[PDB]
């Protein structure tokens, strides 16, 4: 709604982002081809998603900053930082698709799977990250929140990288170990690898831009947002298997990749002894026959129904938390985001 | 000499770097295994090189800061930022070895070639980068140069990433094109991919720590340092082929990887028509027979003698530049570094 009404405006601003990124260096004609590759990397990897994270920066900014202080420059900075969150996303996704050996993303072939690209995508990803800070310097260098934003983007990256490390350590290829797939480990993984950058980061950025830098306020917002992020990742694990790749834009790999997904953890909590052996024998392997076996067992344990139930209970819990912690911020801030990821 | 007398002190400080990096998070026991992977990544990829870049921060700091202002905290920050440059190095090298399909580094198997690691090394690299800014926040958060250092490390990364992009664009696998291997393109590649982070960055960091933030002074230092960096990369290209892997610690891949190396550019400038065809037929291929062919032609054109001559002429030019641009900085600053990479 508020996201939907802002989407088009947000996207149209992408041309300027690209222009300022592919101009401030073109005064150095020697790197021209590199700059041209950068544009290509940006168009392919920053466009095509839902932009919920970037839009959140924009929406939250408008709801937190008094309209008398929302000048043209002020708004420009807001959707610029919104695009910075979108680039952090792109950066992690490009690397993540390589490390998960994924095939498609956002309804097109993964960048690293594009003939001509391959492992060069590693450097491409690093460039996407560098661009965040180019844009911050360009548009916010003079703002009082400049250092707060820089540290917030860096901190959020470290956290999601710590989370990725957990994600990958818990999922050795060729090493089946159902034993390590617990609730505790799962909660810790998703907290770091998704919850900070996808939910805390955008709202926290808008808070700093609105002059809201108070520690307690940020902690209170974080309380709500991390819990939403946990829900979001669990929903992401569900879609990996039970979602239509025509709508998700991506092919699942979690079972093949031996991941500590929410599905397998829930499967293990409901698994009879015989079922456990079926899981242990077919999990984390590339064979389509064995993956199908795992899915069949998930469906035999009504995990699809268990997810529908979790989603409702979780949503109610998020709402409760918003009632508790939203103040003094507008509740619409969190309600708007929550509405966007519900089901 | 001054580098040598400082080496041991510098290295011994690595234990503390690791401790502070693997402690400030251990208050979060949930990420403990990730933190343990981080320690493992740090020990394997930050140790074993010459530490010329880190040592430069330390040496330059001592020569630029008045001894009355070199308190214990002040020195601690200096070798900490020195280790930050070393981590930037590690970060790029881990990714670079993957993208160049290299086998060894610093006399051991490349991290990504270690059984158990593979492409997870992409995230490991990203962690090494994140650590730079953790350490900066930890030890320099209160210093007046804090934001200058942060932007200097970010800018230097963007530049070396732009350079890597040039390095990789000019070297498509399976796509031989001697035509693109020119002097101009070479100078532009090495300027961005090596010269900034390996030579300007360390000295510039010590300058900001010594309160020397003046634009003209930094530009003047940059004039000297980029030219040294060009020399250093050219020396690196020479060693890739004509160096002993027992001393370099790495196996060459430039010819196989179809790289715009200094050797091939010099070969092309001296290549008779028939020799050109030999180059075009055997360059950028994995076959050991064809690589040997390229090397034979390099030796037929006395490129080893041409490098020895370039090194002398270049060294004299660097010295000239130091005479011109060193002031008001101690010349020992640049002489010390130059002495360290001579031959
Ligand atoms: O399931 P993953 O965590 O790999 C994923 O959600 C990406 N990701 C990576 C960190 N956080 C999220 P994706 O399903 O989009 O491949
Ligand atoms: O020759 P490269 O530039 O790949 C190298 O010098 C690494 N590097 C990467 C950027 N700058 C330098 P290395 O020979 O150590 O593999
Ligand atoms: Mg993935
Ligand atoms: Mg992943
Ligand atoms: Mg997923
Ligand atoms: Mg290399
Ligand atoms: Mg390289
Ligand atoms: Mg080399």
PDB file of C-alpha atoms in Angstrom, chain B residues 61-323:
ATOM      1  CA  UNK B  61      54.319   6.539  11.932  1.00  0.00           C
ATOM      2  CA  UNK B  62      57.524   6.519  14.002  1.00  0.00           C
ATOM      3  CA  UNK B  63      59.306   8.756  11.485  1.00  0.00           C
ATOM      4  CA  UNK B  64      56.439  11.218  11.205  1.00  0.00           C
ATOM      5  CA  UNK B  65      55.226  11.512  14.790  1.00  0.00           C
ATOM      6  CA  UNK B  66      57.403  13.366  17.299  1.00  0.00           C
ATOM      7  CA  UNK B  67      58.773  10.870  19.867  1.00  0.00           C
ATOM      8  CA  UNK B  68      57.173  12.896  22.657  1.00  0.00           C
ATOM      9  CA  UNK B  69      53.790  12.019  21.153  1.00  0.00           C
ATOM     10  CA  UNK B  70      54.512   8.315  20.671  1.00  0.00           C
ATOM     11  CA  UNK B  71      52.905   7.047  23.873  1.00  0.00           C
ATOM     12  CA  UNK B  72      51.990   3.382  24.403  1.00  0.00           C
ATOM     13  CA  UNK B  73      48.411   3.843  23.197  1.00  0.00           C
ATOM     14  CA  UNK B  74      49.636   5.855  20.225  1.00  0.00           C
ATOM     15  CA  UNK B  75      51.983   3.076  19.102  1.00  0.00           C
ATOM     16  CA  UNK B  76      49.322   0.446  19.690  1.00  0.00           C
ATOM     17  CA  UNK B  77      46.981   2.223  17.296  1.00  0.00           C
ATOM     18  CA  UNK B  78      49.785   2.448  14.719  1.00  0.00           C
ATOM     19  CA  UNK B  79      50.499  -1.287  14.494  1.00  0.00           C
ATOM     20  CA  UNK B  80      46.750  -1.952  14.679  1.00  0.00           C
ATOM     21  CA  UNK B  81      46.149   0.145  11.541  1.00  0.00           C
ATOM     22  CA  UNK B  82      49.224  -1.568  10.110  1.00  0.00           C
ATOM     23  CA  UNK B  83      47.445  -4.873  10.686  1.00  0.00           C
ATOM     24  CA  UNK B  84      44.320  -3.405   9.073  1.00  0.00           C
ATOM     25  CA  UNK B  85      46.303  -2.859   5.852  1.00  0.00           C
ATOM     26  CA  UNK B  86      47.507  -6.441   6.188  1.00  0.00           C
ATOM     27  CA  UNK B  87      43.873  -7.634   6.433  1.00  0.00           C
ATOM     28  CA  UNK B  88      42.897  -5.606   3.364  1.00  0.00           C
ATOM     29  CA  UNK B  89      45.726  -7.489   1.631  1.00  0.00           C
ATOM     30  CA  UNK B  90      44.478 -10.844   2.910  1.00  0.00           C
ATOM     31  CA  UNK B  91      40.946 -10.018   1.826  1.00  0.00           C
ATOM     32  CA  UNK B  92      41.945  -9.264  -1.782  1.00  0.00           C
ATOM     33  CA  UNK B  93      44.391 -12.162  -1.998  1.00  0.00           C
ATOM     34  CA  UNK B  94      41.873 -14.790  -0.911  1.00  0.00           C
ATOM     35  CA  UNK B  95      39.398 -13.608  -3.573  1.00  0.00           C
ATOM     36  CA  UNK B  96      42.186 -13.064  -6.122  1.00  0.00           C
ATOM     37  CA  UNK B  97      43.547 -16.604  -5.810  1.00  0.00           C
ATOM     38  CA  UNK B  98      40.058 -17.923  -6.540  1.00  0.00           C
ATOM     39  CA  UNK B  99      39.583 -15.680  -9.567  1.00  0.00           C
ATOM     40  CA  UNK B 100      43.068 -16.428 -10.974  1.00  0.00           C
ATOM     41  CA  UNK B 101      42.671 -20.157 -10.225  1.00  0.00           C
ATOM     42  CA  UNK B 102      45.939 -20.099  -8.324  1.00  0.00           C
ATOM     43  CA  UNK B 103      47.436 -23.086  -6.515  1.00  0.00           C
ATOM     44  CA  UNK B 104      49.732 -21.774  -3.761  1.00  0.00           C
ATOM     45  CA  UNK B 105      50.153 -18.551  -1.825  1.00  0.00           C
ATOM     46  CA  UNK B 106      52.861 -17.652   0.671  1.00  0.00           C
ATOM     47  CA  UNK B 107      54.287 -21.136   0.322  1.00  0.00           C
ATOM     48  CA  UNK B 108      51.127 -23.007   1.248  1.00  0.00           C
ATOM     49  CA  UNK B 109      48.021 -24.129  -0.577  1.00  0.00           C
ATOM     50  CA  UNK B 110      45.573 -21.324  -1.342  1.00  0.00           C
ATOM     51  CA  UNK B 111      42.819 -21.119   1.294  1.00  0.00           C
ATOM     52  CA  UNK B 112      40.092 -21.923  -1.268  1.00  0.00           C
ATOM     53  CA  UNK B 113      42.038 -25.007  -2.386  1.00  0.00           C
ATOM     54  CA  UNK B 114      42.097 -26.386   1.158  1.00  0.00           C
ATOM     55  CA  UNK B 115      39.855 -29.423   1.333  1.00  0.00           C
ATOM     56  CA  UNK B 116      36.821 -28.304   3.308  1.00  0.00           C
ATOM     57  CA  UNK B 117      36.896 -24.662   2.216  1.00  0.00           C
ATOM     58  CA  UNK B 118      36.267 -24.156  -1.480  1.00  0.00           C
ATOM     59  CA  UNK B 119      33.931 -21.295  -2.349  1.00  0.00           C
ATOM     60  CA  UNK B 120      33.062 -20.646   1.300  1.00  0.00           C
ATOM     61  CA  UNK B 121      36.331 -18.645   1.082  1.00  0.00           C
ATOM     62  CA  UNK B 122      34.271 -15.921  -0.596  1.00  0.00           C
ATOM     63  CA  UNK B 123      32.504 -15.232   2.713  1.00  0.00           C
ATOM     64  CA  UNK B 124      35.763 -15.732   4.629  1.00  0.00           C
ATOM     65  CA  UNK B 125      37.278 -12.950   2.507  1.00  0.00           C
ATOM     66  CA  UNK B 126      34.324 -10.688   3.226  1.00  0.00           C
ATOM     67  CA  UNK B 127      34.929 -11.273   6.966  1.00  0.00           C
ATOM     68  CA  UNK B 128      38.560 -10.263   6.655  1.00  0.00           C
ATOM     69  CA  UNK B 129      37.379  -6.983   5.157  1.00  0.00           C
ATOM     70  CA  UNK B 130      34.801  -6.439   7.924  1.00  0.00           C
ATOM     71  CA  UNK B 131      37.554  -6.906  10.515  1.00  0.00           C
ATOM     72  CA  UNK B 132      39.416  -3.820   9.276  1.00  0.00           C
ATOM     73  CA  UNK B 133      36.552  -1.633  10.421  1.00  0.00           C
ATOM     74  CA  UNK B 134      35.984  -3.537  13.678  1.00  0.00           C
ATOM     75  CA  UNK B 135      39.591  -2.785  14.612  1.00  0.00           C
ATOM     76  CA  UNK B 136      39.354   0.839  13.482  1.00  0.00           C
ATOM     77  CA  UNK B 137      36.285   1.329  15.682  1.00  0.00           C
ATOM     78  CA  UNK B 138      37.953  -0.468  18.599  1.00  0.00           C
ATOM     79  CA  UNK B 139      41.250   1.426  18.653  1.00  0.00           C
ATOM     80  CA  UNK B 140      40.636   4.722  16.816  1.00  0.00           C
ATOM     81  CA  UNK B 141      36.968   5.515  17.411  1.00  0.00           C
ATOM     82  CA  UNK B 142      37.912   8.581  19.447  1.00  0.00           C
ATOM     83  CA  UNK B 143      40.782   9.866  17.325  1.00  0.00           C
ATOM     84  CA  UNK B 144      40.316  12.964  15.124  1.00  0.00           C
ATOM     85  CA  UNK B 145      41.537  10.947  12.127  1.00  0.00           C
ATOM     86  CA  UNK B 146      38.929   8.169  12.600  1.00  0.00           C
ATOM     87  CA  UNK B 147      36.674   9.145   9.692  1.00  0.00           C
ATOM     88  CA  UNK B 148      39.718   9.905   7.476  1.00  0.00           C
ATOM     89  CA  UNK B 149      41.031   6.335   7.993  1.00  0.00           C
ATOM     90  CA  UNK B 150      37.636   4.726   7.384  1.00  0.00           C
ATOM     91  CA  UNK B 151      37.196   6.610   4.078  1.00  0.00           C
ATOM     92  CA  UNK B 152      40.824   5.896   3.114  1.00  0.00           C
ATOM     93  CA  UNK B 153      40.383   2.134   3.569  1.00  0.00           C
ATOM     94  CA  UNK B 154      37.024   2.198   1.717  1.00  0.00           C
ATOM     95  CA  UNK B 155      38.338   4.359  -1.154  1.00  0.00           C
ATOM     96  CA  UNK B 156      41.425   2.158  -1.505  1.00  0.00           C
ATOM     97  CA  UNK B 157      39.241  -0.964  -1.697  1.00  0.00           C
ATOM     98  CA  UNK B 158      36.993   0.531  -4.406  1.00  0.00           C
ATOM     99  CA  UNK B 159      40.097   1.468  -6.408  1.00  0.00           C
ATOM    100  CA  UNK B 160      41.691  -1.924  -6.138  1.00  0.00           C
ATOM    101  CA  UNK B 161      38.299  -3.485  -7.059  1.00  0.00           C
ATOM    102  CA  UNK B 162      38.036  -1.209 -10.093  1.00  0.00           C
ATOM    103  CA  UNK B 163      41.542  -2.400 -10.937  1.00  0.00           C
ATOM    104  CA  UNK B 164      40.631  -6.050 -10.499  1.00  0.00           C
ATOM    105  CA  UNK B 165      37.687  -5.478 -12.837  1.00  0.00           C
ATOM    106  CA  UNK B 166      40.151  -4.113 -15.434  1.00  0.00           C
ATOM    107  CA  UNK B 167      42.527  -7.006 -14.703  1.00  0.00           C
ATOM    108  CA  UNK B 168      39.720  -9.525 -15.344  1.00  0.00           C
ATOM    109  CA  UNK B 169      38.073  -7.756 -18.330  1.00  0.00           C
ATOM    110  CA  UNK B 170      41.384  -7.622 -20.188  1.00  0.00           C
ATOM    111  CA  UNK B 171      41.897 -11.334 -19.579  1.00  0.00           C
ATOM    112  CA  UNK B 172      38.847 -13.336 -20.757  1.00  0.00           C
ATOM    113  CA  UNK B 173      39.522 -17.079 -20.548  1.00  0.00           C
ATOM    114  CA  UNK B 174      39.325 -18.761 -23.938  1.00  0.00           C
ATOM    115  CA  UNK B 175      39.432 -15.318 -25.565  1.00  0.00           C
ATOM    116  CA  UNK B 176      42.905 -14.563 -26.880  1.00  0.00           C
ATOM    117  CA  UNK B 177      43.392 -10.941 -27.854  1.00  0.00           C
ATOM    118  CA  UNK B 178      46.978  -9.716 -27.936  1.00  0.00           C
ATOM    119  CA  UNK B 179      45.581  -6.504 -29.385  1.00  0.00           C
ATOM    120  CA  UNK B 180      44.295  -5.288 -26.024  1.00  0.00           C
ATOM    121  CA  UNK B 181      47.622  -5.842 -24.245  1.00  0.00           C
ATOM    122  CA  UNK B 182      49.052  -2.315 -24.543  1.00  0.00           C
ATOM    123  CA  UNK B 183      51.298  -0.145 -22.382  1.00  0.00           C
ATOM    124  CA  UNK B 184      48.440   2.263 -21.643  1.00  0.00           C
ATOM    125  CA  UNK B 185      46.065  -0.471 -20.508  1.00  0.00           C
ATOM    126  CA  UNK B 186      48.781  -2.066 -18.409  1.00  0.00           C
ATOM    127  CA  UNK B 187      49.639   1.176 -16.597  1.00  0.00           C
ATOM    128  CA  UNK B 188      45.950   1.767 -15.881  1.00  0.00           C
ATOM    129  CA  UNK B 189      45.403  -1.764 -14.564  1.00  0.00           C
ATOM    130  CA  UNK B 190      48.311  -1.834 -12.153  1.00  0.00           C
ATOM    131  CA  UNK B 191      47.616   1.683 -10.940  1.00  0.00           C
ATOM    132  CA  UNK B 192      44.231   0.650  -9.633  1.00  0.00           C
ATOM    133  CA  UNK B 193      44.731  -3.019  -8.708  1.00  0.00           C
ATOM    134  CA  UNK B 194      48.012  -2.663  -6.818  1.00  0.00           C
ATOM    135  CA  UNK B 195      49.455   0.822  -6.539  1.00  0.00           C
ATOM    136  CA  UNK B 196      46.830   2.449  -4.335  1.00  0.00           C
ATOM    137  CA  UNK B 197      46.383  -0.186  -1.618  1.00  0.00           C
ATOM    138  CA  UNK B 198      49.938  -1.459  -1.480  1.00  0.00           C
ATOM    139  CA  UNK B 199      51.811   1.833  -1.499  1.00  0.00           C
ATOM    140  CA  UNK B 200      49.656   4.925  -1.136  1.00  0.00           C
ATOM    141  CA  UNK B 201      47.338   3.421   1.527  1.00  0.00           C
ATOM    142  CA  UNK B 202      49.945   2.537   4.199  1.00  0.00           C
ATOM    143  CA  UNK B 203      51.825   5.822   3.993  1.00  0.00           C
ATOM    144  CA  UNK B 204      48.605   7.853   3.780  1.00  0.00           C
ATOM    145  CA  UNK B 205      47.274   6.106   6.897  1.00  0.00           C
ATOM    146  CA  UNK B 206      50.369   7.061   8.898  1.00  0.00           C
ATOM    147  CA  UNK B 207      50.125  10.611   7.589  1.00  0.00           C
ATOM    148  CA  UNK B 208      46.567  10.959   8.866  1.00  0.00           C
ATOM    149  CA  UNK B 209      47.577   9.447  12.197  1.00  0.00           C
ATOM    150  CA  UNK B 210      50.406  12.001  12.455  1.00  0.00           C
ATOM    151  CA  UNK B 211      47.899  14.773  11.876  1.00  0.00           C
ATOM    152  CA  UNK B 212      49.079  15.289   8.284  1.00  0.00           C
ATOM    153  CA  UNK B 213      45.802  15.553   6.396  1.00  0.00           C
ATOM    154  CA  UNK B 214      46.747  18.278   3.962  1.00  0.00           C
ATOM    155  CA  UNK B 215      45.508  17.651   0.458  1.00  0.00           C
ATOM    156  CA  UNK B 216      48.674  18.816  -1.330  1.00  0.00           C
ATOM    157  CA  UNK B 217      50.922  16.767   0.935  1.00  0.00           C
ATOM    158  CA  UNK B 218      48.858  13.643   0.265  1.00  0.00           C
ATOM    159  CA  UNK B 219      48.864  14.280  -3.459  1.00  0.00           C
ATOM    160  CA  UNK B 220      52.634  14.793  -3.391  1.00  0.00           C
ATOM    161  CA  UNK B 221      53.125  11.530  -1.497  1.00  0.00           C
ATOM    162  CA  UNK B 222      50.732   9.795  -3.886  1.00  0.00           C
ATOM    163  CA  UNK B 223      52.886  10.942  -6.804  1.00  0.00           C
ATOM    164  CA  UNK B 224      55.843   8.999  -5.425  1.00  0.00           C
ATOM    165  CA  UNK B 225      53.901   5.981  -4.207  1.00  0.00           C
ATOM    166  CA  UNK B 226      51.805   5.147  -7.294  1.00  0.00           C
ATOM    167  CA  UNK B 227      54.987   5.071  -9.385  1.00  0.00           C
ATOM    168  CA  UNK B 228      56.595   2.707  -6.852  1.00  0.00           C
ATOM    169  CA  UNK B 229      53.451   0.573  -7.037  1.00  0.00           C
ATOM    170  CA  UNK B 230      53.648   0.356 -10.810  1.00  0.00           C
ATOM    171  CA  UNK B 231      57.244  -0.823 -10.428  1.00  0.00           C
ATOM    172  CA  UNK B 232      56.164  -3.333  -7.757  1.00  0.00           C
ATOM    173  CA  UNK B 233      53.421  -4.864  -9.904  1.00  0.00           C
ATOM    174  CA  UNK B 234      55.781  -5.148 -12.904  1.00  0.00           C
ATOM    175  CA  UNK B 235      58.243  -6.910 -10.626  1.00  0.00           C
ATOM    176  CA  UNK B 236      55.322  -9.152  -9.552  1.00  0.00           C
ATOM    177  CA  UNK B 237      54.555 -10.019 -13.175  1.00  0.00           C
ATOM    178  CA  UNK B 238      58.199 -10.855 -13.788  1.00  0.00           C
ATOM    179  CA  UNK B 239      58.342 -13.153 -10.739  1.00  0.00           C
ATOM    180  CA  UNK B 240      55.139 -14.924 -11.820  1.00  0.00           C
ATOM    181  CA  UNK B 241      57.138 -16.608 -14.589  1.00  0.00           C
ATOM    182  CA  UNK B 242      60.840 -16.140 -13.865  1.00  0.00           C
ATOM    183  CA  UNK B 243      60.744 -16.432 -10.087  1.00  0.00           C
ATOM    184  CA  UNK B 244      61.402 -19.503  -7.974  1.00  0.00           C
ATOM    185  CA  UNK B 245      58.153 -20.673  -6.292  1.00  0.00           C
ATOM    186  CA  UNK B 246      60.359 -21.699  -3.384  1.00  0.00           C
ATOM    187  CA  UNK B 247      61.088 -18.041  -2.674  1.00  0.00           C
ATOM    188  CA  UNK B 248      57.908 -16.390  -3.995  1.00  0.00           C
ATOM    189  CA  UNK B 249      55.666 -18.913  -2.243  1.00  0.00           C
ATOM    190  CA  UNK B 250      53.339 -18.984  -5.255  1.00  0.00           C
ATOM    191  CA  UNK B 251      52.946 -20.734  -8.608  1.00  0.00           C
ATOM    192  CA  UNK B 252      52.515 -18.525 -11.663  1.00  0.00           C
ATOM    193  CA  UNK B 253      49.300 -18.525 -13.701  1.00  0.00           C
ATOM    194  CA  UNK B 254      49.527 -15.347 -15.789  1.00  0.00           C
ATOM    195  CA  UNK B 255      50.115 -16.989 -19.178  1.00  0.00           C
ATOM    196  CA  UNK B 256      47.404 -19.634 -18.585  1.00  0.00           C
ATOM    197  CA  UNK B 257      45.018 -16.980 -17.237  1.00  0.00           C
ATOM    198  CA  UNK B 258      45.501 -14.856 -20.391  1.00  0.00           C
ATOM    199  CA  UNK B 259      46.667 -11.873 -18.319  1.00  0.00           C
ATOM    200  CA  UNK B 260      47.814  -8.448 -19.443  1.00  0.00           C
ATOM    201  CA  UNK B 261      51.152  -9.019 -17.731  1.00  0.00           C
ATOM    202  CA  UNK B 262      54.131  -6.692 -18.227  1.00  0.00           C
ATOM    203  CA  UNK B 263      56.012  -9.550 -19.885  1.00  0.00           C
ATOM    204  CA  UNK B 264      53.452 -10.083 -22.644  1.00  0.00           C
ATOM    205  CA  UNK B 265      53.175  -6.354 -23.318  1.00  0.00           C
ATOM    206  CA  UNK B 266      56.950  -6.101 -23.659  1.00  0.00           C
ATOM    207  CA  UNK B 267      56.965  -9.268 -25.763  1.00  0.00           C
ATOM    208  CA  UNK B 268      54.426  -7.693 -28.106  1.00  0.00           C
ATOM    209  CA  UNK B 269      56.528  -4.578 -28.531  1.00  0.00           C
ATOM    210  CA  UNK B 270      59.539  -6.642 -29.563  1.00  0.00           C
ATOM    211  CA  UNK B 271      57.677  -9.395 -31.409  1.00  0.00           C
ATOM    212  CA  UNK B 272      58.570 -10.100 -35.024  1.00  0.00           C
ATOM    213  CA  UNK B 273      55.589 -11.126 -37.142  1.00  0.00           C
ATOM    214  CA  UNK B 274      56.298 -14.850 -36.810  1.00  0.00           C
ATOM    215  CA  UNK B 275      56.868 -14.576 -33.065  1.00  0.00           C
ATOM    216  CA  UNK B 276      53.535 -12.769 -32.755  1.00  0.00           C
ATOM    217  CA  UNK B 277      51.822 -15.821 -34.178  1.00  0.00           C
ATOM    218  CA  UNK B 278      53.629 -18.081 -31.733  1.00  0.00           C
ATOM    219  CA  UNK B 279      52.358 -15.884 -28.902  1.00  0.00           C
ATOM    220  CA  UNK B 280      48.818 -15.787 -30.276  1.00  0.00           C
ATOM    221  CA  UNK B 281      48.717 -19.564 -30.675  1.00  0.00           C
ATOM    222  CA  UNK B 282      50.023 -20.533 -27.246  1.00  0.00           C
ATOM    223  CA  UNK B 283      48.937 -17.738 -24.882  1.00  0.00           C
ATOM    224  CA  UNK B 284      46.071 -18.056 -22.399  1.00  0.00           C
ATOM    225  CA  UNK B 285      45.893 -21.868 -22.485  1.00  0.00           C
ATOM    226  CA  UNK B 286      46.298 -24.450 -19.714  1.00  0.00           C
ATOM    227  CA  UNK B 287      48.547 -26.800 -21.724  1.00  0.00           C
ATOM    228  CA  UNK B 288      51.992 -26.913 -20.143  1.00  0.00           C
ATOM    229  CA  UNK B 289      53.483 -27.423 -23.606  1.00  0.00           C
ATOM    230  CA  UNK B 290      52.056 -24.105 -24.812  1.00  0.00           C
ATOM    231  CA  UNK B 291      52.942 -22.143 -21.677  1.00  0.00           C
ATOM    232  CA  UNK B 292      56.542 -23.347 -22.038  1.00  0.00           C
ATOM    233  CA  UNK B 293      56.414 -22.119 -25.624  1.00  0.00           C
ATOM    234  CA  UNK B 294      55.499 -18.599 -24.478  1.00  0.00           C
ATOM    235  CA  UNK B 295      58.290 -18.550 -21.908  1.00  0.00           C
ATOM    236  CA  UNK B 296      60.792 -19.726 -24.507  1.00  0.00           C
ATOM    237  CA  UNK B 297      59.850 -16.758 -26.681  1.00  0.00           C
ATOM    238  CA  UNK B 298      60.144 -14.352 -23.748  1.00  0.00           C
ATOM    239  CA  UNK B 299      63.678 -15.669 -23.192  1.00  0.00           C
ATOM    240  CA  UNK B 300      64.444 -15.428 -26.908  1.00  0.00           C
ATOM    241  CA  UNK B 301      63.583 -11.731 -26.711  1.00  0.00           C
ATOM    242  CA  UNK B 302      65.791 -11.223 -23.653  1.00  0.00           C
ATOM    243  CA  UNK B 303      62.819 -10.005 -21.614  1.00  0.00           C
ATOM    244  CA  UNK B 304      64.701 -11.087 -18.464  1.00  0.00           C
ATOM    245  CA  UNK B 305      67.434  -8.611 -19.435  1.00  0.00           C
ATOM    246  CA  UNK B 306      64.811  -6.006 -20.332  1.00  0.00           C
ATOM    247  CA  UNK B 307      63.312  -6.297 -16.858  1.00  0.00           C
ATOM    248  CA  UNK B 308      66.697  -5.899 -15.162  1.00  0.00           C
ATOM    249  CA  UNK B 309      67.178  -2.730 -17.213  1.00  0.00           C
ATOM    250  CA  UNK B 310      63.672  -1.415 -16.504  1.00  0.00           C
ATOM    251  CA  UNK B 311      64.170  -1.979 -12.780  1.00  0.00           C
ATOM    252  CA  UNK B 312      67.278   0.219 -12.701  1.00  0.00           C
ATOM    253  CA  UNK B 313      65.791   2.994 -14.834  1.00  0.00           C
ATOM    254  CA  UNK B 314      62.619   2.852 -12.774  1.00  0.00           C
ATOM    255  CA  UNK B 315      64.454   2.926  -9.452  1.00  0.00           C
ATOM    256  CA  UNK B 316      66.340   6.029 -10.600  1.00  0.00           C
ATOM    257  CA  UNK B 317      63.049   7.630 -11.590  1.00  0.00           C
ATOM    258  CA  UNK B 318      61.462   6.845  -8.201  1.00  0.00           C
ATOM    259  CA  UNK B 319      64.519   8.403  -6.501  1.00  0.00           C
ATOM    260  CA  UNK B 320      64.181  11.494  -8.686  1.00  0.00           C
ATOM    261  CA  UNK B 321      60.524  11.750  -7.668  1.00  0.00           C
ATOM    262  CA  UNK B 322      61.444  11.428  -4.004  1.00  0.00           C
ATOM    263  CA  UNK B 323      63.903  14.316  -4.414  1.00  0.00           C
TER     264      UNK B 323
END
